[PDB]
Amino acid sequence: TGLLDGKRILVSGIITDSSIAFHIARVAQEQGAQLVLTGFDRLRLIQRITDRLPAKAPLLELDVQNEEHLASLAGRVTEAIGAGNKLDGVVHSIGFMPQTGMGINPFFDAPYADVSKGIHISAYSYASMAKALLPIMNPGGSIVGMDFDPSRAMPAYNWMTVAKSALESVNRFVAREAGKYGVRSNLVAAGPIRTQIQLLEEGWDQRAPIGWNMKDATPVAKTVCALLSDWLPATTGDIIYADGGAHTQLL
Amino acid sequence: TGLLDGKRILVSGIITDSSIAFHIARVAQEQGAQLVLTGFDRLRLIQRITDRLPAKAPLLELDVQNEEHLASLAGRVTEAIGAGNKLDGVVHSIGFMPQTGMGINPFFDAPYADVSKGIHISAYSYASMAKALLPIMNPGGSIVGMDFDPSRAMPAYNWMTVAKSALESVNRFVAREAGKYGVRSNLVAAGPIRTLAMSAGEEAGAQIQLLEEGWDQRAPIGWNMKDATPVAKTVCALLSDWLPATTGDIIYADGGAHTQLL
Amino acid sequence: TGLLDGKRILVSGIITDSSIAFHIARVAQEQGAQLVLTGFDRLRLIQRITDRLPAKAPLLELDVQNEEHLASLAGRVTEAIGAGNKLDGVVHSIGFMPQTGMGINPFFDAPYADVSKGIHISAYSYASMAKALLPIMNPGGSIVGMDFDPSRAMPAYNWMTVAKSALESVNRFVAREAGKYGVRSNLVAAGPIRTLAMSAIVGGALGEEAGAQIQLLEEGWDQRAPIGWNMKDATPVAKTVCALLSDWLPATTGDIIYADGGAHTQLL
Amino acid sequence: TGLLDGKRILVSGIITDSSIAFHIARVAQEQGAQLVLTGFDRLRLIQRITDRLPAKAPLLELDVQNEEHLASLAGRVTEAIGAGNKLDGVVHSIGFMPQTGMGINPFFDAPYADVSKGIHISAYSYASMAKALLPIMNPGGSIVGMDFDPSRAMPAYNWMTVAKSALESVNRFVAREAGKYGVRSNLVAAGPIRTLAMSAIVGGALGEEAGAQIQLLEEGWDQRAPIGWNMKDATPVAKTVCALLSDWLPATTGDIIYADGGAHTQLL
Ligand SMILES: NC(=O)c1ccc[n+]([C@@H]2O[C@H](COP(=O)([O-])OP(=O)(O)OC[C@H]3O[C@@H](n4cnc5c(N)ncnc54)[C@H](O)[C@@H]3O)[C@@H](O)[C@H]2O)c1
Ligand SMILES: NC(=O)c1ccc[n+]([C@@H]2O[C@H](COP(=O)([O-])OP(=O)(O)OC[C@H]3O[C@@H](n4cnc5c(N)ncnc54)[C@H](O)[C@@H]3O)[C@@H](O)[C@H]2O)c1
Ligand SMILES: NC(=O)c1ccc[n+]([C@@H]2O[C@H](COP(=O)([O-])OP(=O)(O)OC[C@H]3O[C@@H](n4cnc5c(N)ncnc54)[C@H](O)[C@@H]3O)[C@@H](O)[C@H]2O)c1
Ligand SMILES: NC(=O)c1ccc[n+]([C@@H]2O[C@H](COP(=O)([O-])OP(=O)(O)OC[C@H]3O[C@@H](n4cnc5c(N)ncnc54)[C@H](O)[C@@H]3O)[C@@H](O)[C@H]2O)c1
Ligand SMILES: Cc1csc([C@](C)(O)c2n[nH]/c(=N/C(=O)Cc3c(F)cccc3F)s2)n1
């Protein structure tokens, strides 16, 4: 008798068993949700990985930069869940920024084509996914995406931080559209998960009043399932921080 | 089978059956929680209201301005839940600001005696409750307070808004103390709710009506000010195990109004 | 003697005499700044307009999507201002989102080619300008870009709101780079100003539904603002940008100054 | 010809010549301002200190907790500046939390009697001053208060952080009331400044641990700040206050300007 019993939920973003979306999927199933999964590029590898979930679930291909993939998605989901059935939840757990805009490469050296690809995949796609899927979502449903707090600049993350700032703004507009379908849209801002950079991750655990385990994706997956559930029915266009409370503390 | 099965939860601030705390209590019990209730001043009448709840729960007296009430609280809760047992949740649903600091009385005309009392009860008491009860709380536990978004000023609410701003800062420090016990501390920022207080000058009501109509239109999923259940349910989410990495934070149960400009 | 007496300040984004940049340039000049102006595309149209400023200034061509314009910008500015001289201020007053991303067009119907162009021009370009010009900036210098508060969603602004969220994040990163030169970086978040594009939307050009939305946004701004807001008057915004170009906010960087009548601090 | 030429400005909160208010007063006087000062308790020590300002100014007594001092303030200021004259600027640089609420003491051990005193002095008194002074303020006038960013919890500051949170909210209401007079109300959020009480804690007055926490805070501030942060130097903060009292930020009210080297805009 689980949190998400009899809910139909789409989960994107699994590439490995340490992917945040793997753990979102694992916990959702453990809570009685029936899943449809989406994957990008290495679909052979991803079938392998999704087999490790506790229950079978169909795996659809979705490259968020492919307009055909997006145009046909609602139909393909409906064939996999069965006509007359609709989704109750959608999980966006997709993000990418080329190495020129993330890492040791100076901020000013990122060419715009790279930044733009990163923003397409990491931010614009959240609207793309909601566009495709809202027509096949039931009232009371929920769309959740994955955020990393971009309110302050930080070393290394650079243009990925910019892209997450874009995502948060995207999420607010998607909530206006989702509202029309009685559907909620929110992001979970997670702490750093091991799916300058080490000094940033070590600072997290000390700021977090309850600590932060960067090797454990479960507290993040649980928070996403909270948002997929009926238990936060008045929250939309918002961000829930699953970060051990680190963003609430200066030192 | 319930969201809060076998959890022991203290719930303060029930005065009428339209109190937000009444509805947190009702939903908590529907979800298998075993409750201890606290009440201020009007305890006989408060029993006459809590009788209407789904299950029996002990009612203790607690005036958060009374130092003895606070010093004796851990003990009286421990007598009510049985020695060797500790609370898994605490709900602060306590707020007050005298007429001088809220309504049609000019902002500048509220005396500090009134403002200080308002802040004591509405903000400082969150720290008081956490002090008294953290020693009798289980790891994985959760303290939750009730907030009204004070990020932007608004007509009428005046010094009450100032007090909620204080509360949000208190919440972040209470989170530091609660962390030591593996306990979380969060606030739910509710949209406006028609309790007996809100259902009570002339231009004051008009600005409050404008505030509330504005809330529902801004809220992408709408806002029913007559329905406390969405707020209660959000408080139960936080009392549950499903938000275990969130502390010193604010969850908005406001229909998403605060995320929209128009 | 004036607020910016002796400062050399590059000001971009003049297209008409209702441009926010026109007013920034005017006020800067009234306060003793020596300007270099940059313009996009219609340079002869812009020359006619810049002739209406209190003083003359060199006008250079800068299309922020042109990588060669950017590569040559510092060399060309040095020519204009005299070799051995450097800039003390740079104003980015450049923004653009195609009508597919901003207006009556539904949020979900904006194709990514159009969004990406608008982000290149409205957000990324702030980093581009900083990259090109920081090498010719003096310590205690100031880069100011224009912003429109994207903290909460709103009708019509749509993907321009998203581009301003990006811009806020870019400014925080530009501040880190600018810090190495002793140069500060901030945005001025303005209230709605009746420039060319905003005049068009009100009055029907995109239909009565779009015209009504924006009129409700504007009227709501003035009433929320404790000192009121005059959408017809860019001077208070220009003065704010000049504040930030001066030496009077020397410890503010990576930040946003709101010149919006205080509207964003009030709910109703 | 200076920033505040001929403006009449009340400046509260001078105690020593390292006080933030002392530097605000000095800079305001350097920029041609005509001052009226207010002081608390040790009015003998304060007279001595204010005599070290560049120009003479009337010194009135003001204990913000005294209701008679507030009820008479307007009348006493008027007597000091001349009948038919009004104030253009008011500076609130008054803050206090007893050691039970700030320092090494556990957060939960602050009695409310001490917290309430700190909130009275540090937050409510921003409302009280504006109530007393707005009726003798000119349109285009400015009230400016002092803030320390309370958005995130931090060790030691405890209930003063809470007070600053209440101050920020108070400021947004004061803006509403001041707007009716054509007057702006803003707070300046400063980085840590080595004033009397701070220099003590770093010297070891409060012990090993308080000294080590404040030293960690200051170090981190300077590294987070892209332009750095010199805690010995109050001048950037004083300048920022003067910017706000001037006519150069005329569309900013109910707001917070950060004079913190940009530290609050960077995580690491
Ligand atoms: N790991 C962290 O520290 C952290 C922190 C905060 C937020 N997040 C976010 O969580 C989400 C998931 O990332 P993760 O840490 O689980 O890493 P991950 O590498 O497992 O997942 C990223 C996913 O994005 C997908 N993707 C990339 N390009 C795509 C395209 N063109 N079309 C469709 N999908 C595409 C990949 O297939 C991959 O499954 C991301 O949005 C990430 O930015 C991660
Ligand atoms: N109703 C709304 O619109 C709204 C919106 C957001 C947040 N809130 C907050 O939610 C909480 C609950 O308020 P409500 O709307 O349920 O109104 P309510 O009047 O039903 O409840 C307020 C409670 O505060 C208690 N209280 C007052 N003084 C006390 C003291 N000295 N000691 C202990 N308790 C004391 C009262 O007895 C009462 O039970 C408050 O903090 C309120 O500020 C209310
Ligand atoms: N008008 C408002 O209500 C308002 C409110 C807040 C902020 N802003 C911002 O102020 C800035 C100025 O806008 P405005 O209202 O003065 O309108 P405007 O049209 O006068 O300014 C836009 C300028 O951007 C320039 N531009 C467009 N593409 C360019 C390119 N590829 N390279 C270089 N320049 C290019 C245009 O030529 C024009 O000079 C923008 O950043 C805008 O987003 C405007
Ligand atoms: N690190 C810092 O020093 C720092 C950082 C940010 C903000 N601030 C703020 O700047 C302001 C000035 O503080 P400072 O560092 O110059 O300290 P300071 O001690 O130099 O000045 C504080 C002033 O508060 C006055 N005061 C206390 N109780 C009073 C009362 N009842 N009536 C009138 N005045 C009273 C004192 O007389 C004193 O002049 C305060 O609000 C402070 O919180 C300080
Ligand atoms: C924030 C803001 C408000 S007005 C503004 C700018 C710089 O003037 C604009 N940039 N891009 C703009 N784009 C549009 O208005 C979309 C649009 C057009 F670009 C052209 C015709 C109609 C139309 F609706 S307006 N930026």
CATH number, domain with residue D31:
3.40.50.720
Helix axes of A158-179 and A125-133: crossing angle, nearest 10 degrees: 20
B112 three-state secondary structure: helix
First to last CA, chain D: 41
The resolution in Å comes to 2.0
Residue A48: count of CB within 10 angstroms of its CB? 12
Q: Which helix (H) or strand (E) holds A11?
A: strand A8-12
Instruction: Judge whether C187 and C168 are in contact, CB under 8 Å.
Output: yes
Q: Give me the torsion for CA of A142, A143, A149, A153, rounded to 10°.
A: -150
- Spatial distance between the Cα atoms of D263 and B79, rounded to a whole number of angstroms: 50
Q: Return the structure tokens found at A178.
A: 């989702």
Residue A196: count of CB within 10 angstroms of its CB? 12
Q: Identify which of B13, B6, B59 has the alpha carbon closest to the alpha carbon of residue B188.
A: B13
B189 three-state secondary structure: strand
Please indicate whether, in this complex, the C-beta atoms of C266 and B152 are within 8 angstroms of each other: yes
Instruction: Judge whether D156 and D136 are in contact, CB under 8 Å.
Output: no
Closest listed ligand to the CA of D187? 4
Measured over the CA atoms of residue D187, residue A209, residue B68 and residue B89, the dihedral's sign is positive
- Spatial neighbors of D212 by CB under 8 A, at least 6 apart, are none
The 3-state DSSP composition of chain A as helix, strand, coil percent (nearest 5) reads: 45, 20, 40
- Spatial distance between the Cα atoms of B166 and B160, rounded to a whole number of angstroms: 10
Q: Return the structure tokens found at A15.
A: 């590439």
Backbone angles phi, psi at A190, to 5 degrees: -95, 155
Instruction: Judge whether B89 and B9 are in contact, CB under 8 Å.
Output: yes
Which one-letter DSSP state was computed for residue C105? S
Partner residues linked to D258 by β-bridges: D189
Q: Identify which of A66, A77, A27 has the alpha carbon closest to the alpha carbon of residue A188.
A: A27
Instruction: Judge whether A185 and A130 are in contact, CB under 8 Å.
Output: yes
Measured over the CA atoms of residue D117, residue D118, residue D124 and residue D129, the dihedral's sign is positive
Q: Return the structure tokens found at D214.
A: 């404040």
* Angle at CA of residue C117, ends C111 and C118, nearest 5°: 95
Q: Return the structure tokens found at A101.
A: 């805009």
Q: Identify which of A111, A134, A147 has the alpha carbon closest to the alpha carbon of residue A239.
A: A147
Transcribe A116-175 into DSSP letters: HHHHIIIIIHHHHHHHHHGGGEEEEEEEEEEE---SSB-TTTHHHHHHHHHHHHHHHHHH
- Spatial distance between the Cα atoms of C245 and C11, rounded to a whole number of angstroms: 11
Query: Chains that contact B by 3+ CB pairs under 8 Å?
Result: A, C, D
Which one-letter DSSP state was computed for residue B135? G
Q: How far is CA B121 from CA A114, B65, B127, B128, B239, in A?
A: 54, 7, 10, 10, 22
| Strand duo A34-39 + A8-12: pairing | parallel
Q: Return the structure tokens found at D192.
A: 């840590």
Identify from B69, B112, B187 which residue to disrupt to test chain D contact, counting D C-beta atoms within 10 A and taking the largest count.
B112
Segments forming the whole domain that contains residue A155: 1-251
> Per-residue b/e over B98-122, b at no fewer than 16 CB within 10 Å?
bebbbbebebeebebebbbbbbbbb
Nearest to B246 among A172, A185, A223 (CB): A223
- Spatial neighbors of C144 by CB under 8 A, at least 6 apart, are C89, C90, C91, C92, C185, C186, C187, C188, C241, C244, C245
Instruction: Judge whether A160 and A192 are in contact, CB under 8 Å.
Output: no
Q: Return the structure tokens found at B19.
A: 């109190």
For the beta sheet containing D255-259, the strands, ordered from the edge strand earlier in sequence to the opposite edge, are D59-61, D34-39, D8-11, D87-92, D137-147, D184-190, D255-259
Which one-letter DSSP state was computed for residue B104? S
Instruction: Judge whether C255 and C187 are in contact, CB under 8 Å.
Output: yes
- Spatial neighbors of B150 by CB under 8 A, at least 6 apart, are B161, B162, B164, B165, B168, D169
Q: Is the CB of C95 under 6 A from ligand 3?
A: yes
Nearest CA to ligand 3 atom 33: C63
Q: Which helix (H) or strand (E) holds D119?
A: helix D112-119
- Spatial distance between the Cα atoms of B249 and B168, rounded to a whole number of angstroms: 8
Q: Is the CB of B38 under 6 A from ligand 2?
A: no
Number of domains in chain D: 1
- Spatial distance between the Cα atoms of D97 and D120, rounded to a whole number of angstroms: 10
Q: Which helix (H) or strand (E) holds D115?
A: helix D112-119
Query: Chains that contact C by 3+ CB pairs under 8 Å?
Result: A, B, D
Measure B258 CA to ligand 3 centroid, in angstroms: 28
Q: Which residue in this structure is represented by tokens 């007597």?
A: D79
Please indicate whether, in this complex, the C-beta atoms of C170 and A162 are within 8 angstroms of each other: yes
Q: Given its phi and psi angles, is residue D207 left (phi above 0), alpha (psi -120 to 50 degrees) or beta? A: left
E strands along D40-167, which residues? 59-61, 87-92, 137-147
Q: Identify which of C193, C209, A8 has the alpha carbon closest to the alpha carbon of residue D251.
A: C193
- Spatial distance between the Cα atoms of B149 and B158, rounded to a whole number of angstroms: 12
Backbone angles phi, psi at A144, to 5 degrees: -130, 135
Ligand 1 atom with the smallest distance to the CA of A42 is: 37
Which one-letter DSSP state was computed for residue C265? G
Measure C123 CA to ligand 5 centroid, in angstroms: 14
Residue B72: count of CB within 10 angstroms of its CB? 16
Q: Which residue in this structure is represented by tokens 């007079």?
A: D181
Q: Return the structure tokens found at B38.
A: 């606290």
Q: Within 13 A of D133's CA, how many CA atoms are on the CB side?
A: 32
Instruction: Judge whether C240 and D249 are in contact, CB under 8 Å.
Output: yes
Nearest CA to ligand 2 atom 41: B95
Residue C56: count of CB within 10 angstroms of its CB? 11
The answer to the question of whether A181 is labelled as a binding residue is no
- Spatial distance between the Cα atoms of D256 and D264, rounded to a whole number of angstroms: 12
Backbone angles phi, psi at C250, to 5 degrees: -75, -10
Instruction: Judge whether D164 and D147 are in contact, CB under 8 Å.
Output: yes
Q: Return the structure tokens found at C184.
A: 């500060």
* Distance, C-alpha C110 to centroid of its chain: 24
- Spatial distance between the Cα atoms of B76 and B253, rounded to a whole number of angstroms: 32
In single-letter form, the type of residue at position A103 comes to: G
Q: Identify which of B219, B177, C24 has the alpha carbon closest to the alpha carbon of residue D158.
A: B177
E strands along chain A, which residues? 8-12, 34-39, 59-61, 87-92, 137-147, 184-190, 238-242
Burial class (CB in 10 A: 0-12, 13-18, 19+), C15: buried
Q: Identify which of B253, B139, B158 has the alpha carbon closest to the alpha carbon of residue A240.
A: B253
Chain D 202-241, residues with CB within 8 Å of chain A CB atoms: 213, 216-217, 220
Instruction: Judge whether B220 and B256 are in contact, CB under 8 Å.
Output: yes
First to last CA, chain A: 41
- Spatial distance between the Cα atoms of D241 and D235, rounded to a whole number of angstroms: 10
Instruction: Judge whether C19 and C43 are in contact, CB under 8 Å.
Output: no
Q: Return the structure tokens found at D3.
A: 């920033």
- Spatial distance between the Cα atoms of B98 and B110, rounded to a whole number of angstroms: 9
Q: Identify which of C198, C193, C181, C168 has the alpha carbon closest to the alpha carbon of residue C131.
A: C181
The answer to the question of whether C72 is labelled as a binding residue is no
Burial class (CB in 10 A: 0-12, 13-18, 19+), D159: buried
Helices (H) and strands (E) in chain D, counts: 9, 7
- Spatial neighbors of A203 by CB under 8 A, at least 6 apart, are A246, D268
Q: Give me the torsion for CA of C152, C154, C157, C158, rounded to 10°.
A: 80
Instruction: Judge whether B129 and B181 are in contact, CB under 8 Å.
Output: no
Closest listed ligand to the CA of C63? 3
B162 three-state secondary structure: helix
E strands along D128-181, which residues? 137-147
Q: Return the structure tokens found at D263.
A: 């530290």
Q: Is the CB of C221 under 6 A from ligand 3?
A: no
Backbone angles phi, psi at B4, to 5 degrees: -120, 35
Q: Which residue in this structure is represented by tokens 């207010």?
A: D38
C265 contacts in chain D (CB < 8 Å): 172, 175, 253-255
- Spatial distance between the Cα atoms of B39 and B36, rounded to a whole number of angstroms: 10
Instruction: Judge whether C116 and C166 are in contact, CB under 8 Å.
Output: no
Measured over the CA atoms of residue C41, residue C45, residue C47 and residue C49, the dihedral's sign is negative
C173 contacts in chain A (CB < 8 Å): 107, 153, 158, 161-162
- Spatial distance between the Cα atoms of A192 and A164, rounded to a whole number of angstroms: 14
